[model samples]
Target chain A: NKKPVNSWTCEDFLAVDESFQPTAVGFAEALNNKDKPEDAVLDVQGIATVTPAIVQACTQDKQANFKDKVKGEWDKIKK
Target chain B: NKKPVNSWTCEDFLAVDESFQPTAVGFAEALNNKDKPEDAVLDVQGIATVTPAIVQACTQDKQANFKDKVKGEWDKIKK
Candidate 1:
């Protein structure tokens, strides 16, 4: 089964699709902005916090297949 | 005229297309890897270094209009 987003380390996050890195970073920043309105910098530490969010966002979007890949990985771990 | 790639701030680079952000980051990391193999991490600092390369790379490819937009911005700054 694929490792959970909660279990991802920084290297794991970096290893996500190269094309999604920027989007991932933006989402991370937005998440931080929403949670920590006074201090919302999208730095390395913040990036780690958003991997789960990315998985959740991709899970719901019908426009792309990233959700499938992530879910597939998760299933492997579950088995 | 468009501002030189050398002049782009981190915010300017971040402001590039959301979809292209990961690509840009990857390109930046690659460039840094080529130059600093010992420290090729794709961190924010390294990200700022590859904006010009992204422009050049996109300029040569016929697949997308990002090149056109970048060039157009440059032309405006040139005037």
Candidate 2:
């Protein structure tokens, strides 16, 4: 069986069809791409906070800057 | 082996981890989720035309509107 959404490893969420739920596509993308310490995973609250920023970068076509900002956000949130 | 990117069916693109290329995550998302008529796949030109709009929707956190806008952009570009 496909893993449930909550239990899905970051990799698993990234592997599914998102058009099926465009409303949540950004959410899935954020979950998969979120930068945390090697052992740290993003929590739901962190996801809620960062998804819009990722989407903003995507829209701005400033995706080149994505890595640093997401990492920064994680730093701010995780501590 | 992973299918070459150009030959990847929409399903294949959706089945990969997108975080590795944060710069093109939006591109991959758009490619996999792009709305097109059955049998009429999006081409490079069409993808170029609609990616920003898709990103715009994602940024606004309005992905709920993704389907209609993508379909409309296709209508305007495809014929």
Best prediction by lDDT? 1
Number of colliding residue pairs in each model: 11, 0
Give the total clashing residue pairs for model 1.
Answer: 11
Alpha-carbon shift of residue B40 in model 2 (angstroms): 31
Best candidate according to DockQ: 1
Stretches off by above 4 angstroms in model 1 are: A1-20, A23-79, B1-18, B21-28, B31-40, B56-79
Model 1 over residues A1-79: C-alpha lDDT tens digits?
1333234344555456654554434432232233223233333322334445555555455344442434444345447
Regions more than 4 Å wrong, model 2: A1-42, A61-65, B1-79
Candidate 1: RMSD over Cα atoms? 15.8
Name the weakest run of 10 consecutive residues (lDDT summed) in model 2 chain A: A34-43
DockQ of model 2 vs. true complex: 0.02
